[model samples]
Target: GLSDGEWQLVLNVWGKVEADVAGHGQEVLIRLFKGHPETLEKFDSFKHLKSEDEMKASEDLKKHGNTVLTALGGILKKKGHHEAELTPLAQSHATKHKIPVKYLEFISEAIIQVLQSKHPGDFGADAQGAMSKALELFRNDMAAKYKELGFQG
Candidate 1:
């Protein structure tokens, strides 16, 4: 559970970061690919891109990133009521998408990295800590669904 101040930090930073959904989402995917090349392997379409530039330029990347960003926008809108709002998404990802909870954590980390890079001063230690905790809460909620489906994170 986040304190009121922490909630404010998360909502404020997310509001700014989500303003350029395309760019922010693209950056997260690109960074994820760079950080964990195997992540690209999971995507049959994206694994073929030869360079970072090519990856960024790919329409598929944009489309997929946009999907993720849009879903994130929905989740972020829930703010303080995150777990309740995320339940359906978590269940769907576990049963329908078969996405491991690990990828959710990866995306969360990438989002935080992007926020810190894009707004260095605005995302201070306090804000960053708050964001980390929020991500954990998100992961916990999602992980519960995964566990319910007998899929571990």
Candidate 2:
């Protein structure tokens, strides 16, 4: 879930917060790590990145992704799924990817947009198709980011 460097940064920055928060931080982190097993098993390795470069790439992807997802979410909400369908995914993704849930919402929103556009006649079909396309795009985009940031600038 965290790169070695990121973990170092976190402990460097928030180890004190962890101490002040007592065991609550661990509980929250554990929840983020484990997610709600009762709901859906689809979140196994939601935000896993293998290296520090991957971690940084993920961060920037999420940053740009936020603007993309926000507008996209509004579009989906108008299409009628509400935010609930996407919330947990965002939460778990944030924990897994080490980004914020809001950013994951961005990815979710973009996926919703893609899915909503595929088969306009039937919302479900459209959503699924759009989601498929979006996932592919997201995958490629992340790959690009990883490549871009993998080396020193």
Candidate 3:
């Protein structure tokens, strides 16, 4: 769990990207694609996208990317509790899409890369550490939720 200040640090820093989350999401998705090319097919609709050019331009990529980013972004709306926004997200991706933890880690780090490239100045070591921990919590929580609701596919 994050300290109160650590939570605020994440919220305030993430605030910089929240407004244009979808826009940021596309690149984050694409960034993950580069790291694990096979992960591209995780997006069934995106299977037809043959190149970076296609993935970059695909509307559905942006859509799924938005879903992924929003799920990670919308944590902690309560007393460090967020199942309200998290449950369905963890459920759908775990059962319907089978979003494995590896992909989750990839996307989390990819999203952090986006934050760094976009606004590295304010993202100091402390902010980056807090961001990593937040997403680590996100990744761990989603994996547990996935395990709880397993193999529905």
Candidate 4:
């Protein structure tokens, strides 16, 4: 759980990134692919986009990135804890997309990068800590959901 001050920092930092959801979303996925090139293999639709330039030019990647960004927007907008709300998304990813928890962690790190790069002035240590906690909660919930879908860890 985040303290009131931590929550405020989350809002402040999220406010800036939310302003350009599509762009930031695209950046998030791009960073993920760059940080962990092996992750792309999980996405059959995006496996062809091997290089940064290819990913940047792929409209399909852009759309999927926005989908993820929109989901994050929804979670941020929800009041109080939203881990339960993330369960369905995680289940869907596990069952339908077969995305493992490790790849999810990769994306989480990319999200942190997006938050950090987007609000360098506002994302201080406190804000980073809060964001890290939030993502950890999200990742934990997702991992549980993945296991619930009968997949091996």
lDDT of each: 0.81, 0.37, 0.80, 0.81
Q: In candidate 1, what are the lDDT values of residues 1-153, reduced to their tens digit?
A: 888888888888888867788888888899888887777777777768878989878988987887888887777667657666677787777776677778887888888888888899899999899889878877887787678768775
Better of 1 and 2 by TM-score: 1
Worst 10 residues of 4 by lDDT: 76-85
Off by over 4 Å in 2: 1-122, 151-153
lDDT of 4 by residue, 70-123 (tens): 887678666356766787787678778777788878898999998788777888
Candidate 4 residue pairs that clash:
none
Write model 3 residue lDDT over 1-153, tens digit each, in one string. 989889988888878778788998898988888878888887677778888998888888899788766766667445259767778888778777777788888878887898999879978899999888888887787777877876422
- The C-alpha TM-scores of every prediction are 0.89, 0.26, 0.88, 0.89
So what's the TM-score on candidate 3? 0.88
CA displacement after TM-score superposition, residue 44 of candidate 3 (Å): 1.2
Off by over 4 Å in 1: none
lDDT comparing candidate 4 with the true structure: 0.81
Tell me the TM-score of model 4. 0.89
Q: List residue ranges in candidate 3 displaced over 4 A.
A: 76-79, 150-153
